[PDB]
Amino acid sequence: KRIAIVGAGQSGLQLGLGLLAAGYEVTMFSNRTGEDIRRGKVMSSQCMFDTSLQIERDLGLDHWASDCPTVDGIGLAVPHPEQKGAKVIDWAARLNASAQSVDQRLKIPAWMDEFQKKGGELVFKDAGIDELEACTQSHDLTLVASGKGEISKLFERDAHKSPYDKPQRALALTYVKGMAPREPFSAVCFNLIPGVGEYFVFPALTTTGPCEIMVFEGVPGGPMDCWADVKTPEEHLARSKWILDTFTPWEAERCKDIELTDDNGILAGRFAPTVRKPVATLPSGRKVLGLADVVVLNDPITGQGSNNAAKCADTYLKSILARGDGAADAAWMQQTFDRYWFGYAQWVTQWTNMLLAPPPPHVLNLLGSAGAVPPLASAFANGFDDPRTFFPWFADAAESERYIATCAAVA
Amino acid sequence: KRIAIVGAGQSGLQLGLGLLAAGYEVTMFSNRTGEDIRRGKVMSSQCMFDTSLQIERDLGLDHWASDCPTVDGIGLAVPHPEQKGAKVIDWAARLNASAQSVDQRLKIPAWMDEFQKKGGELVFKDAGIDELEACTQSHDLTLVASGKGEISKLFERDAHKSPYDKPQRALALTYVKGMAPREPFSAVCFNLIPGVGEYFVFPALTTTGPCEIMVFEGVPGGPMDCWADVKTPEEHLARSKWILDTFTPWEAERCKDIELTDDNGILAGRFAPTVRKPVATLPSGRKVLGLADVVVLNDPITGQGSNNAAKCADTYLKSILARGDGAADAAWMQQTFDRYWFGYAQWVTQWTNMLLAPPPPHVLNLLGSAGAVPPLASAFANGFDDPRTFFPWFADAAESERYIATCAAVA
Numbered sequence A, B: 001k002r003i004a005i006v007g008a009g010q011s012g013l014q015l016g017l018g019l020l021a022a023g024y025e026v027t028m029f030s031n032r033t034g035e036d037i038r039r040g041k042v043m044s045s046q047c048m049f050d051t052s053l054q055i056e057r058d059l060g061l062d063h064w065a066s067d068c069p070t071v072d073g074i075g076l077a078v079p080h081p082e083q084k085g086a087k088v089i090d091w092a093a094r095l096n097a098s099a100q101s102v103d104q105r106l107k108i109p110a111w112m113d114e115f116q117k118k119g120g121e122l123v124f125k126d127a128g129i130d131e132l133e134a135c136t137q138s139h140d141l142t143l144v145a146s147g148k149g150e151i152s153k154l155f156e157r158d159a160h161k162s163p164y165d166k167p168q169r170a171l172a173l174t175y176v177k178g179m180a181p182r183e184p185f186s187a188v189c190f191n192l193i194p195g196v197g198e199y200f201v202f203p204a205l206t207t208t209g210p211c212e213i214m215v216f217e218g219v220p221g222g223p224m225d226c227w228a229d230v231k232t233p234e235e236h237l238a239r240s241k242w243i244l245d246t247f248t249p250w251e252a253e254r255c256k257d258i259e260l261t262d263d264n265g266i267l268a269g270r271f272a273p274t275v276r277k278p279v280a281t282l283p284s285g286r287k288v289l290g291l292a293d294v295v296v297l298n299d300p301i302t303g304q305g306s307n308n309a310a311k312c313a314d315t316y317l318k319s320i321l322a323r324g325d326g327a328a329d330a331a332w333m334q335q336t337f338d339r340y341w342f343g344y345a346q347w348v349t350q351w352t353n354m355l356l357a358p359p360p361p362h363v364l365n366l367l368g369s370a371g372a373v374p375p376l377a378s379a380f381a382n383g384f385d386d387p388r389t390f391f392p393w394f395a396d397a398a399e400s401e402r403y404i405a406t407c408a409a410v411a
C-alpha cells in the first residue's frame, strides 16, 4: 500500500508514476527542485531504444514522442590507419524501430510535476540514513533510486559482478545546435579510434529544442583524456571541435556551424563500472532495495543506462504488483533484483565491459565483416535494443564465425 | 498486407489472430477440423506461466482464465534411496503469479472459430510443397507453424544448436478426474527418480471440465520406458497407476479414485530435441519462415513448449508489425528468428537439454539446498516463467555456490 522512493530520477519517477496509477501511496524524496534540474547541467545522453520507449508509452509517459527527433539507425566508422583522413570501416544499418533521446532536464522535472498532480507525496531533502530509517518505519517498502549520488554507497559493492574498480573511460558530453543532419537517415554515428577512445553523436531533444549530443570517451591518459584543463563553456566547445578535427574529420565536416545549446549543455567526468548487492541493511536492522544505477552502473559506451533504468523500473513494478499484500522482505527484494540481473542486466553489463577492453581479433573481424554483410550490421544495430542478442557470437571467436556465415547466407 | 500460415496450432493461431487485429489479411491452412481436434487425442500438457499467459491476455485470447484451475507453485520430490517409500528431498515454492493449462483440444478449435469470425481465411488441406509454392506467390510472407508435423522437415536441422539426435525420454500423458487436490496450494509436483525418469502432475482444464494431467518421462530402456505393450485406455490408466505405486507412492495416495477424463485423454510417444534453420527455400527459390516448434523443439520435461509457442509468436508478430511495408526477405526472416533464439530460446533450450542428461554434483547440491533455503526454491519455481534467470548459476558449480550463498543471506 505505501511505497517510499529516495531519488527523483528516471527509474524512480517511472516506478513512482506506475505505482500511483496502480493505486499505491508513494512518497518520493528529491534533493533538487524541478526548475534547478531543467536549468542545471546535462546528466546524460539518454538514447532510448524502442523496447524502453514502449515501456514509457504503456505508462502514458511518452510526452515528447512527437517533438523529439528520431534516431533511425546505428553507424560505425574506423579511421584508416594509413590513408590520411579516411576510413577503413564505414557502415550503417537501420534500427527496426526508432530510438529517441529526451534530455533528462526536460523529462525528470515534467515527471516530478505529474507525480504531484497524480497524488504522489513529493518531499524535498537531501536524504541520508535518518530519512531511510524514517521511511522504513512508515512504508511497506523503501527503494533507493539515487543514481551516482552519495547514498548509493550504502549498498555493498558486488566484486564478482564488477570486473573493474577504476574508470575505463574519460567521458564528456556536448549538446549542440547547428550540426548538419545525417542523411539519408539519422543514426548513432560511432567512431572507434583504436587505442584512443570513441566519439559518437546523435540527434535529441533538449530544453531549447532539437539538437545533437556529442559523446566522447577516452582511454585514460591518452589524447582523448583531455578535459582536465577545460574550464569554460567556450573551451569545452573548442576542445570538442578539436577531437573531431584530429581524429574524425569526416564528422568535423558536419560541424562547421555548431553552437552549444546552452552554457550547461556540457559535462565531463568518469566513474568505475559497478554492480552492487540490492539489499542494504540500515543501522536499525530495517532493509532498503536499490534500483537501477544504484545496483547496476555501466559505462555509457553502449548507451544503455537509461534503457536499463526503464527496464529495471518495469521489472520492479511488475514484481511489486504481483506481490499484492505480501511482505516486501529481504528475500522478495533479492528475488526482484535477481530476475532483472540474471534475466537481463548481466548481459548488458558483460557486453559493455567487453567493449571497454581492447577488442580481440574475432571482434575486429565482426566489425569489418559487417560493412560487407548487411544482415550482420543489422544484427549489430538492433542488438542495442536487447543486448542479450549479442550472445554467444560476439564474445566467442568460433561462434562469431558461425554467425557471420548465418548472416552471409541470407544477404 | 497478406500473410499465409501453414498449421493451425497454438503459435500459428495466436500469430494469425494478432495479425487480423492489426489489420492484415491472413490465410491459414489446417489439416484438421475444429471438432476432430476437440474430440481427438490430447497433444500436450500445456502448462503456461504468467508471462506467456499475459501475452494471451494482451490479445484478448484468455477465454478460459476464469474456468481453468490455477497452478500456484512448483514442487520437487526425490525418493529416499534407503528408507522405503519416503523422500530424501521434498519441497515446494509458490509462483509469483499463477500458471494455467488449457487443453489445446479446447483452445485451438475455439481460436480457429475466432480466426474465421474475425475475417481470417481458413483453408482445410494437408499442405505440402505445392501449397507453399502457391502461398508464396500470393502472399507477402508465408510461415510454417506445423509443430511436429511432417512438412517441418523441410527446414534444415541445425546440428550445432541440437546436441541430441535421439529421444532422451519416453513420454506419456494421462488426463484424469478424481485426483485429490494438492493442499494448501496447487503445484507442478515434480518427482525425480534417479536414473529412471520423472513424473510430474498438475491441474488443468479439458473438454469435460477441470482435471489433472499426469506426465511421465522415462530414460529410454529403463523401467519407465514402459508404454510399448499398452494398447487400450484401460491399460494406459493401469500402467500410469503402476508407475506411481512403484516409484512415487506418496503421489499414489492422491490417486485412489482416478478415472480418465475420456478415452482420448492419453498419449505416448517420443522425439529428439531439435533446432532447425528458420528459412527454407522452396523448389521455385521462394522462401518460407518457420515458427515455434518447427524451429525450436524441446523435450517437455521443463514444460516450455507452449510457453515458447506464445513468446515465439509474440516476437514474430512484433517483428512483422515493425517491418511495415518492408519486404519479408530472407534477411528479415533470419533476423526475426535470431532475436527469438539469441535473446530467449537458446536459454530455455540449454536448460532443458541439461536436465535431460544425468545431473552433475552441483545440480544435486542445488536441488537439496532448495529444501532448506526457501529463496533458492523460490528462484527455481519462478525460473519456469523465464529460464534465462537460471544462468549462470544452474550450469556452473562455482556460480551455483555463490547463488546458494546469496539466497541463504536473505532467508
Ligand SMILES: Cc1cc2nc3c(=O)[nH]c(=O)nc-3n(C[C@H](O)[C@H](O)[C@H](O)COP(=O)(O)OP(=O)(O)OC[C@H]3O[C@@H](n4cnc5c(N)ncnc54)[C@H](O)[C@@H]3O)c2cc1C
Pocket: A006, A007, A008, A009, A010, A011, A012, A029, A030, A031, A032, A043, A044, A045, A046, A047, A048, A125, A126, A127, A128, A145, A146, A147, A148, A149, A150, A151, A171, A172, A173, A267, A291, A292, A293, A294, A300, A302, A303, A304, A305, A306, A307, A308, A309
Ligand atoms: C555522461 C553520460 C552519458 C550517458 N549516455 C547515455 C545514453 O546515450 N543512453 C542511455 O541509455 N544511458 C546513458 N547514460 C546513463 C543514464 O543517464 C543513467 O544510467 C540513467 O539516468 C539511470 O537512471 P536512474 O534512475 O538509476 O538514476 P538518475 O536518473 O541519475 O537519478 C538520480 C537522481 O537522484 C537524486 N539524488 C541523489 N542522491 C539523492 C539523495 N540522497 N536524496 C535525494 N535525491 C537524491 C539526484 O538529484 C539525481 O537526479 C549516460 C550517463 C552519463 C553519465
Ligand SMILES: Cc1cc2nc3c(=O)[nH]c(=O)nc-3n(C[C@H](O)[C@H](O)[C@H](O)COP(=O)(O)OP(=O)(O)OC[C@H]3O[C@@H](n4cnc5c(N)ncnc54)[C@H](O)[C@@H]3O)c2cc1C
Pocket: B006, B007, B008, B009, B010, B011, B012, B029, B030, B031, B032, B043, B044, B045, B046, B047, B048, B125, B126, B127, B128, B145, B146, B147, B148, B149, B150, B151, B171, B172, B173, B267, B291, B292, B293, B294, B300, B302, B303, B304, B305, B306, B307, B308, B309
Ligand atoms: C507429451 C507432450 C507434453 C507437453 N507438455 C507441455 C507442458 O506442460 N507445457 C508446455 O508449455 N509445453 C508442453 N508441450 C509442448 C507444447 O505442446 C508444444 O511445444 C506447442 O504446442 C508448440 O506450439 P506450435 O504452434 O509450434 O505447434 P502445434 O500446437 O503442435 O500446431 C501444429 C498443428 O499443425 C497441424 N499441421 C501439421 N502439419 C500440417 C500440414 N502439413 N498442413 C496443415 N496443418 C498441419 C497439426 O494438425 C497440428 O495441430 C508438450 C508436448 C508434448 C508432446
